[PDB]
Amino acid sequence: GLVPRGSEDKWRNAFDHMLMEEFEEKMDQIEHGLLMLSEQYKELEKTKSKELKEQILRELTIAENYLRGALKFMQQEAKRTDLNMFERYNFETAVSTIEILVKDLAELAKKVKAVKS
Amino acid sequence: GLVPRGSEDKWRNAFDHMLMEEFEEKMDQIEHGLLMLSEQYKELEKTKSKELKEQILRELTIAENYLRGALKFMQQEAKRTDLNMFERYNFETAVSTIEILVKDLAELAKKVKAVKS
């Protein structure tokens, strides 16, 4: 049942496949949540709701914390000495995708904090 | 739309709900992977397959790295200064659930390493 170690084009390890599939799903969910928070931000510019402002900031903090933990996992697996082409590509891509999303979150946080409430 | 901050019986934060709503189910899937590896270990005791031994160890190394990180994360969430009754219970329970899996993984790793291959 074992994937040959010489395979270059697929996940050789079952836990890599499982965990990376769940990570990818979470990144899609976070990107969508950020889009929803951006739209709440648009409402906040008009209403100046203190509760909405504080809540968006809480959400952004939660997402950031999660992504920082994910990033540590990805960077650590990316330092593996035994990495095939497919695995290296998937881990390096994940690192890139997270680092971008962390930036997008921090940018929304800045806009939200700028709302005089 | 926002959950009142005084609510005690649910996730107040959407990103907490997103991250945690299927948590215990996801951990069940890790537990199941550990079961499959335990059963492979029983085959290994008979065959003494070097490849099977190494592959079980690789899988447990990946799961260990994931869980050590998830544990540290959940322990920090349980230190939040604003936690309601439900949020605290769920974070604390998650810490316990992860601790159990970490212990089971370390025990299996020890038995697998001992197979003289």
Author numbering:
A (entry chain A), B (entry chain B): 1 to 117
Sentences from the paper on this structure:
The structure of rDer f 21 adopts a bundle of three anti-parallel α-helices similar to the group 21 HDM allergen Blo t 2116, and group 5 HDM allergens including Blo t 514,15 and Der p 512. The crystal structure of rDer f 21 revealed an elongated dimer structure with molecules A and B interacting in a head-to-toe orientation. Helices α1 and α2 form an intermolecular anti-parallel dimeric interface while the C-terminal α-helix (α3) is fully exposed to the solvent.
The structure contains two molecules per asymmetric unit forming a rDer f 21 dimer. Structural comparison of two molecules A and B representing the asymmetric unit of the rDer f 21PEG400 crystal structure shows a significant structural deviation localised at the α1 helix of molecule B between residues 20-30. The dramatic conformational changes at the helix α1 of the molecule B are caused by the binding of a well-ordered PEG 400 molecule (from the crystallization buffer) in the pocket of the rDer f 21PEG400 molecule. Interestingly, the coordinates of other residues surrounding the ligand binding pocket including F23 and Y66 are well conserved. The conformational changes enable binding of the ligand into the dimer interface cavity, an event which may otherwise be prevented by steric clashes. The binding cavity consists mostly of hydrophobic residues including A70 and three aromatic residues F23, F73, and Y66. The PEG 400 molecule in the cavity of the rDer f 21 dimer interface only forms one hydrogen bond to Y66A (residue Y66 of molecule A) and is further coordinated via several hydrogen bonds with water molecules in the cavity. The lack of direct hydrogen bonds between the PEG 400 molecule and the surrounding residues suggests that the cavity would prioritize a hydrophobic ligand.
